[PDB]
């Protein structure tokens, strides 16, 4: 076994839709290629003793233990490998239930697809499955120590790539509302929505949470001063840094009892709660001073009453929880000694940062605290009354929370909303000390102890003594007020031969409307009028740049098959999904070997259209038109032939099609025809000479029309879009230098070659052509390119791309020469005797083409890089 390639899919992909997280591996079965499990000695027993849990795999039999029966009858090792990967990452607590195995075109390599929950965990499970199976086939068993090591590694990977419970809850709510979410790579920040409609959270702080409010909340004395200036009942306190100031401060606060705490600390380090005389105040002051990071200590009046935590979101009180400290009740005539471990044996209690109820930790400090209680270990509680173990009233110690949201007085709700607004926090956690939350804080001597930014709502979604509150729902309501997701209109263009031109035309048409358009094409990624990134930029890694930009209002993405194969789609759904054509030209790349597979791959865009969205399909292409079914949302057809029976039948019942009827780009809305332009006033069509450009224009116009763009804007965008170097880098570019003309294009496959010929053959001048193709394509494609170039052109100059993609140098050139020779030998008389010659350098090829251009001739260039041809023709004026 040898792992040849390991890819991870994060969106809708070729293998599945709605199963976004997948991992696909090319596994080489060098020696066990046709060895079934029944033909491997001792394989079944070793496998079933290493992992008995496989008995739960309801395989193709569909019954409990069916996979075991499949192994019994003899099965290929790829199937057991995918199953062992599923079970290996399932034992680590990660439920996954998708798996596939396929035979590739090459002899000994399989493709194995495993569902994952964590990317690193999924890759690790895929890598470990083959090692486990190889060890079983070599020795008959797998060591238990290695199995435990692998499970521990998987659990560590799951823990490492995990959000927090607050972020988990908020992300789960956003997913439930259909709002897209992505993980930023900087500071554990999560981005919701797209473009101008996006928001950001870290754990509870949002992108609208103020720096000033957070800093004021972190400052205890500043918060107290601000709240006192606003009439909020804060505790009467003072600060002190030297020993001699203690007596004066205690006089100022109003007597006894008092509270001594540090200015800065964590988990209540060195905070005394209740002191009533001198000496204990002195030791508490010493402890707090040695616990504070700045030697300074708050001393305030002690206020009796229970401790409540009030959560305020968007100025509204969402949840109120009373914090009861760790305690036991002897109502069953049992004392502390039994109950301390009786409570610890309850499944609700747990450690870590997931189970909120913690075990009652009997610390030495806790022993001292229960010493101050006035009772002992075996002292039975009187009458069955609460007896406490600590006084901090915190969940970490082992206390409980009681829901009090339905009992808070309306005046208290108003006061706490005012406190949150005064501090300046959109989400705040306010600590109140009061004898009764159902009465106003003025009647009882209730006080506001502190205000916390980025509070944890972990005690409100699981009170354990009351009703849970949907805090994540309130946060998501604050982030997205109405029934609004964070989506911007997404238009995904896919197809074999017209993605870039259609994407640019769509971007121009939408730019006619006053909107900022972020679009990614083969040339580069643009936002508005300015280039955001250079390169290929046709995969999800460039779609994320557009979808995360804060200024983009409409996203237009050219979605090539390469990105879908590599890592799937960069988005869950698209508003418009355009499929232009599917031609079997570059077959053999990846697992794609038949045009049916290519159609299935390109259908991912069509099947990703949301139910309220549109799928713009070419009715003239049978494979693309076959995608009409299995598409959620409406279908709109475009056809260059106005008499297409399928399109007419579609328009009769419903509408939303586009045709080219009588020198007119027309939209059919059922029984209504709306003409846009004469198709000779559209510059890219070149006075209607290029039909493929007209098809691209039809697709773009239909796509914008389905989204409500006015006909006037479509007309203006279609008229003002130019097919020259100013806008189109290498798409149908004319260059005129007087004596002749230069056509630079991007043709590299037989379909685009035929489309190019359909326009070149109408030129009345001499036809010189420099042709070529990428080196990673099949030989038959090169032969077809050569024969088509022979058919259409009069002078042939064959060049092979410098980046040959692993193919030996030259081979493609002589095979295109073989194709042109075959076409030449297929002619009896001198009907077309085009001259042929091959030079393998781009500069030499274009120089030779431009050197011997006669009067009124046409020289067509199909270079590896557009910038080379652009610069070469710019230098020569």
């Amino acid at each position: 076994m040898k792992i040849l390639k390991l890819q991870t899919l994060r969106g809708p992909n070729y293998w599945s839709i709605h199963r976004h997280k997948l991992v696909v591996m090319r596994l080489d079965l060098e020696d066990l290629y046709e060895k079934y499990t029944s033909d491997i000695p001792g394989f079944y027993k070793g496998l079933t003793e290493v992992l008995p849990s496989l008995v739960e795999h309801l395989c193709s039999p569909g019954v409990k233990g069916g996979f075991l029966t499949r192994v019994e009858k003899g099965t290929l090792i790829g199937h057991v490998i995918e199953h062992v990967a599923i079970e290996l990452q399932e034992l680590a607590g990660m439920p996954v239930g998708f798996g596939r195995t396929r035979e590739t075109s090459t002899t000994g390599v399989f493709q194995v697809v495993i569902e994952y929950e964590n990317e690193q965990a999924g890759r690790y499970a895929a890598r470990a499955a083959v090692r486990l199976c190889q060890s079983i086939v070599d020795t008959g068993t797998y060591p238990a120590t290695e199995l435990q090591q692998d499970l521990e590694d998987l659990k560590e990977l799951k823990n490492q790539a995990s959000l927090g419970p607050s972020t988990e809850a908020i992300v789960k709510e956003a997913e439930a509302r259909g709002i897209p979410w992505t993980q930023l790579g900087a500071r554990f920040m999560i981005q919701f929505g797209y473009g101008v409609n996006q928001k950001k959270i870290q754990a509870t702080l949002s992108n609208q949470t103020g720096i000033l409010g957070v800093e004021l909340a972190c400052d205890k004395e500043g918060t107290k001063r601000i709240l006192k200036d606003a009439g909020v009942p804060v505790p009467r306190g003072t600060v002190a840094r030297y020993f001699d100031e203690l007596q004066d401060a205690i006089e100022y606060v109003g007597g006894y009892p008092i509270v001594i705490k540090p200015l800065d600390g964590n988990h209540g380090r060195g905070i005394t709660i209740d002191v009533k005389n001198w000496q204990e105040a002195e030791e508490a002051y010493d402890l707090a001073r040695k616990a504070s990071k700045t030697k300074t200590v708050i001393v305030e009046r002690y206020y009796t009453g229970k401790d409540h935590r009030v959560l305020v979101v968007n100025g509204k009180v969402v949840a109120v929880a009373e914090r009861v400290p760790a305690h036991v009740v002897g109502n069953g005539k049992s004392t502390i000694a039994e109950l301390i471990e009786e409570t610890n044996r309850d499944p609700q209690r747990g450690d870590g940062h997931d189970n909120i109820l913690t075990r009652i930790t009997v610390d030495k400090s806790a022993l001292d605290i229960l010493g101050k209680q006035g009772y002992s270990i075996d002292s039975i509680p009187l009458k069955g009354k609460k007896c406490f173990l600590r006084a901090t009233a915190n969940l970490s110690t082992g206390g409980i929370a009681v829901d009090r949201t339905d009992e808070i007085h309306p005046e208290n709700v108003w006061l706490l909303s005012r406190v949150a607004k005064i501090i300046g926090l959109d989400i705040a956690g306010i600590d109140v000390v009061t004898e009764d939350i159902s009465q106003p804080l003025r009647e009882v001597e209730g006080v506001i102890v502190e205000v916390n930014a980025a509070p944890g709502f972990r005690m409100h979604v699981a009170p354990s003594r009351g009703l849970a509150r949907n805090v994540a729902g309130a946060v998501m309501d604050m982030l997205f007020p109405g029934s609004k997701n964070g989506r911007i209109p997404i238009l995904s263009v896919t197809g074999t031969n017209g993605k870039t031109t259609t994407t640019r035309l769509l971007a121009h048409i939408i730019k006619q409307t006053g909107k900022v358009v972020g679009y990614t094409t083969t040339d580069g990624t643009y936002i508005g009028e300015y280039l955001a990134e250079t390169g290929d930029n046709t995969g999800p890694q460039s779609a994320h740049l557009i979808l995360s930009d804060p200024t983009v209002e409409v996203a237009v993405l050219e979605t090539a098959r390469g990105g879908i194969l590599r890592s799937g789609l960069g988005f869950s759904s698209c508003e418009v999904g355009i499929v232009l054509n599917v031609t079997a030209d570059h077959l053999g790349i990846g697992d794609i070997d038949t045009i049916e597979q290519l159609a299935k791959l390109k259908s991912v865009v069509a099947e990703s259209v949301m139910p309220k969205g549109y799928a713009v399909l070419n009715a003239e292409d049978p494979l693309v038109a076959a995608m009409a079914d299995r598409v959620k949302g409406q279908v709109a057809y475009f056809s260059m032939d106005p008499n297409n029976e399928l399109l007419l039948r579609h328009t009769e019942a419903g509408g939303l099609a586009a045709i080219y009827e009588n020198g007119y780009i027309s939209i059919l809305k059922g029984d209504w025809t709306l003409r846009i332009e004469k198709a000779v006033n559209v510059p890219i069509t070149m006075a209607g000479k290029a039909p493929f450009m007209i098809a691209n224009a039809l697709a773009a116009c239909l796509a914008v029309f389905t989204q409500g763009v006015k006909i006037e804007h479509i007309r203006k965008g279609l008229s003002t879009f130019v097919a020259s170097v100013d806008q189109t880098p290498g798409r149908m570019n004319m260059f005129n230098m007087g004596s002749y003309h230069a056509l630079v294009d991007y043709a590299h496959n037989p379909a685009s070659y035929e489309a190019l010929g359909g326009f070149v053959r109408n030129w009345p001048g001499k036809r010189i052509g420099v042709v070529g193709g990428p080196g990673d394509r099949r030989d038959e494609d090169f032969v077809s390119l050569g024969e088509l170039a022979a058919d259409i052109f009069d002078e042939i100059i064959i060049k092979e791309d410098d980046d040959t993609r692993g193919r030996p140098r030259g081979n493609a050139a002589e095979l295109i020469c073989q194709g042109v020779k075959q076409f030449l030998n297929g002619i009896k008389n001198s009907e077309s005797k085009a001259t042929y010659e091959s030079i393998l350098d781009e500069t030499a090829a274009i120089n030779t083409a431009l050197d011997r251009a006669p009067i009124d001739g046409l020289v067509v260039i199909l270079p590896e890089s557009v910038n080379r041809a652009i610069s070469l023709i710019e230098g020569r004026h």
Partner: peptide, 4 residues
């Protein structure tokens, strides 16, 4: 700090 964090999740106060």
């Amino acid at each position: 700090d964090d999740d106060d």
